[PDB]
Amino acid sequence: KIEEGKLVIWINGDKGYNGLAEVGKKFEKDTGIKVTVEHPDKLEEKFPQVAATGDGPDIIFWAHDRFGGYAQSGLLAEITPDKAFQDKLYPFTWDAVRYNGKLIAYPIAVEALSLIYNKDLLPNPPKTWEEIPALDKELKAKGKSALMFNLQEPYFTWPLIAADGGYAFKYENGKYDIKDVGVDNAGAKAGLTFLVDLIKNKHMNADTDYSIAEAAFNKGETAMTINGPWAWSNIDTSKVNYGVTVLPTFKGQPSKPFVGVLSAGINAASPNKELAKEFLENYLLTDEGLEAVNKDKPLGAVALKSYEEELAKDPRIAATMENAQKGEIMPNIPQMSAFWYAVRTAVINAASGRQTVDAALAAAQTAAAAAMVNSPLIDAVLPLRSVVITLRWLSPSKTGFLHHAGLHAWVRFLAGSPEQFSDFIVVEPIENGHISYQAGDGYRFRITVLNGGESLLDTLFSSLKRLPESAAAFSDNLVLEKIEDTFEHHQVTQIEDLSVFDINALMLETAVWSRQRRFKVAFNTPARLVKPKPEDGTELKGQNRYCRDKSDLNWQLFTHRLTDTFINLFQSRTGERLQRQNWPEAQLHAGLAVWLNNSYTVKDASGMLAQMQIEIDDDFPADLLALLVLGQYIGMGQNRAFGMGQYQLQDA
Ligand SMILES: OC[C@H]1O[C@H](O[C@H]2[C@H](O)[C@@H](O)[C@@H](O)O[C@@H]2CO)[C@H](O)[C@@H](O)[C@@H]1O
Numbered sequence: 001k002i003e004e005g006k007l008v009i010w011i012n013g014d015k016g017y018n019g020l021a022e023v024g025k026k027f028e029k030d031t032g033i034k035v036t037v038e039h040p041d042k043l044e045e046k047f048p049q050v051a052a053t054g055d056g057p058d059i060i061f062w063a064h065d066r067f068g069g070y071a072q073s074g075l076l077a078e079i080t081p082d083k084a085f086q087d088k089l090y091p092f093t094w095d096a097v098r099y100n101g102k103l104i105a106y107p108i109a110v111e112a113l114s115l116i117y118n119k120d121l122l123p124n125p126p127k128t129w130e131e132i133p134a135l136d137k138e139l140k141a142k143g144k145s146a147l148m149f150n151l152q153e154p155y156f157t158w159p160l161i162a163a164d165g166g167y168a169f170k171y172e173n174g175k176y177d178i179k180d181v182g183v184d185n186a187g188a189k190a191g192l193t194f195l196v197d198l199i200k201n202k203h204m205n206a207d208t209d210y211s212i213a214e215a216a217f218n219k220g221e222t223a224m225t226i227n228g229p230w231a232w233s234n235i236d237t238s239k240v241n242y243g244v245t246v247l248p249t250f251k252g253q254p255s256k257p258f259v260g261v262l263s264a265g266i267n268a269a270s271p272n273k274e275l276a277k278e279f280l281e282n283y284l285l286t287d288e289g290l291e292a293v294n295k296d297k298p299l300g301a302v303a304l305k306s307y308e309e310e311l312a313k314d315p316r317i318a319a320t321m322e323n324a325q326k327g328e329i330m331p332n333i334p335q336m337s338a339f340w341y342a343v344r345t346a347v348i349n350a351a352s353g354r355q356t357v358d359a360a361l362a363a364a365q366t367a368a369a370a371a372m373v374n375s376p377l378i379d380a381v382l383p384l385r386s387v388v389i390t391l392r393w394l395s396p397s398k399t400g401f402l403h404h405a406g407l408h409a410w411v412r413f414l415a416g417s418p419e420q421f422s423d424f425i426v427v428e429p430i431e432n433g434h435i436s437y438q439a440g441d442g443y444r445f446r447i448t449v450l451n452g453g454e455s456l457l458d459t460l461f462s463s464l465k466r467l468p469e470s471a472a473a474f475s476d477n478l479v480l481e482k483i484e485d486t487f488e489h490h491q492v493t494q495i496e497d498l499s500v501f502d503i504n505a506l507m508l509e510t511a512v513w514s515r516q517r518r519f520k521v522a523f524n525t526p527a528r529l530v531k532p533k534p535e536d537g538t539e540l541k542g543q544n545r546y547c548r549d550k551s552d553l554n555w556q557l558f559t560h561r562l563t564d565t566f567i568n569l570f571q572s573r574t575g576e577r578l579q580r581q582n583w584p585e586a587q588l589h590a591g592l593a594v595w596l597n598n599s600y601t602v603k604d605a606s607g608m609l610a611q612m613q614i615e616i617d618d619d620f621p622a623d624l625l626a627l628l629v630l631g632q633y634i635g636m637g638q639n640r641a642f643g644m645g646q647y648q649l650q651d652a
Pocket of ligand 1: 012014044062063064065066111153154155156260262340
């Protein structure tokens with residue numbers, strides 16, 4: 001949980017976090033409240049992961065475009081500055097942090113990309129993108145290059161894509177039309193194609209990221225870069241004579257950067273809300289606070305009127321606002337994360353040659369418009385990680401006798417014998433039944449790790465790597481051959497190498513089953529689904545407690561048990577037990593249903609195998625369909641952590 005009496009702050013590593021820490025040291029001097037300023041990697045994705053369960057920082061610093069989604073998920077508290085304080089900051093910056101009428105963050109600064117160029121290598125910067133290829137040939141003759149900027153984040157490529165007609169969502173009548181995405185019109189195609197032709201003609205490198213581009217410019221190797229005001233600090237250090245100017249035009253149109261408002265949100269689960277307000281209103285959002293941060297890494301055009309009226313005299317800040325005006329302030333709607341994931345994939349795939357520009361942007365238009373999912377039940381379990389582990393026997397042995405219960409206890413032991421094992425790890429063995437193995441034979445099983453289970457996965461990796469010594473069937477007669485990433489189907493050695501099944505992958509998969517409205521639900525391993533509680537007060541006993549006939553299965557029973565699983569996972573993570581709503585009605589017809597008996601001299605292994613046809617409405621809630629899709633990867637019913645209750649969605 002978040003510790004009361006102190007303040008923990010998250011801000012991106014490219015920002016002036018040391019400056020921010022000095023503002024925190026002054027706060028601690030005046031109130032005794034310790035202020036810890038951290039800068040995690042991928043924090044815009046890390047915040048929902050930890051905040052969904054009640055952890056994370058007291059204050060989060062990011063551009064405003066992520067905050068509507070945070071607010072929609074109930075991660076942010078409503079800030080309450082009086083009218084006197086609101087007048088100190090620009091009204092349009094307050095607009096950027098408003099969501100459904102409520103202010104959800106304190107605006108800090110307005111960030112916009114500008115063209116940064118080496119005045120010594122390039123006295124007159126190019127006014128148009130079309131000049132850059134010709135310019136690069138001349139510079140390559142001196143062993144230099146024209147332009148290098150981060151091609152891994154669509155933030156940096158969007159000004160070009162938007163120049164000739166690209167847009168995120170059409171805005172009319174106070175509303176963004178999610179179904180009207182503009183990443184796939186003639187102008188977006190022209191912009192990305194020009195980017196790809198730069199790479200194809202050796203004027204840029206598809207691999208270029210933020211570090212490579214910053215290093216090249218600051219070491220005098222490239223004449224131009226594209227970055228924001230935070231980057232200026234490192235350039236002053238490198239003693240490059242640089243300037244900040246307007247972005248080049250494309251087809252006569254100016255480049256249109258998506259402008260962000262760096263904002264500070266207050267975690268909804270923070271017990272230090274009043275302290276957070278005092279730090280932000282009375283210490284950071286003052287002339288001396290922002291200056292301490294600006295001195296470390298320049299903020300840009302700050303939202304505080306009194307300070308910005310002095311900074312605007314800086315020609316670099318003026319250029320920042322010039323590019324900003326030629327662009328647009330980002331929407332803060334929850335769909336922005338769907339947009340940025342779509343365009344990130346589009347630009348990487350097009351630039352790497354994997355997809356054509358037309359195909360890459362066609363998929364991005366579909367992806368950007370996919371129905372969001374902001375469920376607390378889902379944010380608690382995502383992201384998933386999964387591995388298939390291959391062992392080799394060191395002497396003969398028998399498996400299947402305990403019906404994979406020994407494997408479970410063994411993996412639990414190898415994970416540190418932790419508390420709440422079943423709430424974070426699912427153990428799915430290969431369904432062989434009874435097998436006798438010889439020395440040298442392989443043994444394979446899959447384990448899926450839910451959000452909050454990395455340390456368990458780390459202990460597991462170490463134990464496996466130290467077999468057979470680790471163990472002290474499934475004893476110290478096994479050795480690790482390899483660990484494969486279930487989702488990439490290739491080998492890994494450290495946890496950091498593992499891919500994730502995250503919210504964006506789930507939204508894309510859910511959309512597939514949204515459009516195909518009829519589909520089948522089939523159990524791979526038997527399910528132990530308890531029958532509904534008799535309404536006359538009596539309790540069911542014995543094997544009569546569980547569903548086993550076609551007549552026992554219906555749409556409400558199935559979705560109740562599925563949701564029970566998610567509620568339990570949520571409860572054990574947070575302590576709260578959410579109230580269980582009923583799903584909208586749908587057609588569910590059980591085609592096949594039979595009960596398997598798997599008792600061994602204990603009946604835990606027995607369960608029901610079933611196939612169900614589903615039909616859903618056009619307007620069926622996506623965040624519920626998403627529970628159905630996610631349930632494929634975590635299983636439902638009793639003993640789901642032993643691999644029971646595994647189902648998969650198939651087409652009819
Ligand atoms: O590239 C997608 C990414 O763009 C923006 O992130 C910016 C951020 O606004 C700046 O403060 C700075 O850190 O550069 C980031 C790009 O790496 C959006 O704010 C973000 O939502 C989006 O995913």
